[PDB]
Assembly symmetry: C2
Homo-oligomer: 529 residues x 2
Amino acid sequence: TPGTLLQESLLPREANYLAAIATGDGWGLAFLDVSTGEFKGTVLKSKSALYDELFRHRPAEVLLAPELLENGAFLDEFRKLSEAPFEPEGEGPLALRRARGALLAYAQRTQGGALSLQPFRFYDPGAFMRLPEATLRALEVFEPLRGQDTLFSVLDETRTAPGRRLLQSWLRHPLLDRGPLEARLDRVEGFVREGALREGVRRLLYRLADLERLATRLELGRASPKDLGALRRSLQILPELRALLGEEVGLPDLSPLKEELEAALVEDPPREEEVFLEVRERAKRQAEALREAARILAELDVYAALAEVAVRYGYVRPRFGDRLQIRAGRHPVVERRTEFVPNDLEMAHELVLITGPNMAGKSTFLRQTALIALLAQVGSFVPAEEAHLPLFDGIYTRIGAGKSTFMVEMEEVALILKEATENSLVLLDEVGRGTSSLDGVAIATAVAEALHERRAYTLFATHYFELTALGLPRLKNLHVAAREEAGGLVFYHQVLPGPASKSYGVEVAAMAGLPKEVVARARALLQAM
Amino acid sequence: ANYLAAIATGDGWGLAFLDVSTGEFKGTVLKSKSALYDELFRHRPAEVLLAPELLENGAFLDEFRKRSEAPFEPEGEGPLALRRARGALLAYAQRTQGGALSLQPFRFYDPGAFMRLPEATLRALEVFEPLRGQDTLFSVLDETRTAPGRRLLQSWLRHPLLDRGPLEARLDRVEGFVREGALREGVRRLLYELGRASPKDLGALREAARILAELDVYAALAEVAVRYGYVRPRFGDRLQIRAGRHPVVERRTEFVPNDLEMAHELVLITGPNMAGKSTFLRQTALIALLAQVGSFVPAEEAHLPLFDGIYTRIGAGKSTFMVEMEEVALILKEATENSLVLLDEVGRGTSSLDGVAIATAVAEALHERRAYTLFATHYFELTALGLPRLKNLHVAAREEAGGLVFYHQVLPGPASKSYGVEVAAMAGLPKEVVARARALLQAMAAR
């Protein structure tokens, strides 16, 4: 099972999951990974939120319950999966134990024996900043829309498979309370004001074994000799990392197990077998103290990883409050590929339209904001100079990109309207396009006011002038400019306050390469309107 | 096939295509860097050889790399840049072949004697590659039994015809193995110089083969026109499609056919989306193409004219906007009274006026060109532009039982109501918003 694969030779530093979906008093979602022996599941009400939690954790193999399997209607939609029995195991919401055990009896059936599991955890997709599928896609968080990079690659500075698995979590699960975040930012600020200190741990952690996946294997009876080789090698760095931080990291004292191996082992692990397992046992007697390290280790890995990034790329420790101010911010993604003229932004539960022509930063400008928000609520310094962000509850989008673009996009907005709040952050772009004249400028206005009344931080970017002149108490207008210079125009990657004065359509159009008479007959009909 | 391509400069742009396998040897000289990368795009070579100039040209190099070394010593006779590149192949293959090469009589082709077919059109109509999914016009037509035939069919696609004389000749032939079921049954079931022809090859065993692959497809098509039920298209000056279909999408679900009649006119297509509009535009191009390539098409009856080219502007650094403009620019800059043009929402993703503005120019622009244009838009204003050659067709949505009930029908006369806010509402929009929407609409409606 691509989901029960326990061999370290078929698993990326990232986590993997075997998922099961059972029904009954909510929607049962069980995620398990033989490798890390990670065991967590949950019950969702909204089929929307389900497929969503299912989307963040991207499992490679899904187990559907018999109700869904028979459900040819539900079956083909999920397809637009391996059979196993969902016998309610453990205690908890029906649809949970059904899918939960469904994994157990499926891993154990694809493990030749018993499994090594972690205390089943129960997570709630509500104690964390919301983050829909589309947003993740829109911000190019994990995967890139078109190109190569993503926020992950750019932040990917983790030195251990565990850390990377940890960091990835934090992204898939942003924070809400300031207390935790601060705690993280205080830490991250540590290895940055202690350059040498960060220099040490990073250099030491390099090559460090996967103490988490390793230990998992110890409790599974499959931890080969070589692994102890790496493990011994690891436990040996353990004392060093501990000597640069202090008896404060908490790091256990696994010298006993360390010293043992040193002797009992060949510098390069390929009656001897009777002696081999005797040492293992002595080691595996420290199964948790191992997982303990991994866990406590990954933190530093990341805390220092990011921090490294931050310093390497000039990331400013964010300050929370109730106002959004970005002193010369940047799109951390695109920033690492060319000169990037920064920008500024100030908001407060307002609706800020963004006009002017495209090709001048608008879209990228909307994203550039979401990320900073996200980057902040995840626990890193962001690409700016100064930056005051509020504590967003959610970050919904509606960017770029059976049915038609139109319907799709509507449904997008529908959700936003149906989840956005006075604290939600919303970014709209050309909402209500790909449709006839009036309807266009029509829809746009409703959605606006709609959000406007919601008093949610909304960076609505449009070409609809009408929208810009709608005297509402919380509106605000920013535009970006082009400039018909020596080439044909001269767009500036600057978002300047106040709406755009002229219209640049026919211009851009003309510029693009349109035949001169047409542009004329165009500018004319324009004037004449 | 497969191709090793070389590009040399001098009195045009030298393009040499060669394939060791079939020993196919053909090249050509283009003026427009646009048309170059284009001919280069149809023949999709796996390895390209650039002349010294271009290689040095730091700018030209990285643009080509965004979109192996060998000397280009002018060989044979013909336009400089052509021979230089042409020879670049020989000299390249010869040293990668360990010795001499077996080549066919180098063929100089002028794509200007056939029907045009931009990179994008080919992409848009999902001819060879699929936008999203699995099928393409090729797979669906792919009924050839020999590697040769398939290479022959593929050619015809990549190179549609112009004169009626040759097309008829093909359609007469194709009509043969169809009215002679058994006869086609036979050949189909039966068809199923470099000193390197090993012994095994003889075990199995040009000219004849070429008239075999020619026959291996004449039948291929007919097993498709029979299995997928197509019909033979008579040519002429008028475009009439008696219950046509999108050969691509047809093989995946029930497909409510449609009808269409034109004559160098501009035919707007309104109504909401999700009712066939787009697919309806393509559904037409293909039939045209399928006809000009030499196959029977998915219809009942079908009278097509002899299109010189089939330019598009469908779906889909710079922004959508600029891109799309450039698209239209070309059309305007190549379309003719015989060109077939399909437009979709031309002039969107932009502020109010400018939108309805541009749209009108482009229209009249094409209108004056008198080119068969299936312009599909949501711009009502455009629909009421009293021009002698306009025409209006719309598709409908229907607020029945569910919320709406889109109809895969393309009926004459413009759409009466507007369906925006509807679809919008339908999509799932909050009721007050839709209201505040329908309202603001009405408002703006009665001035």
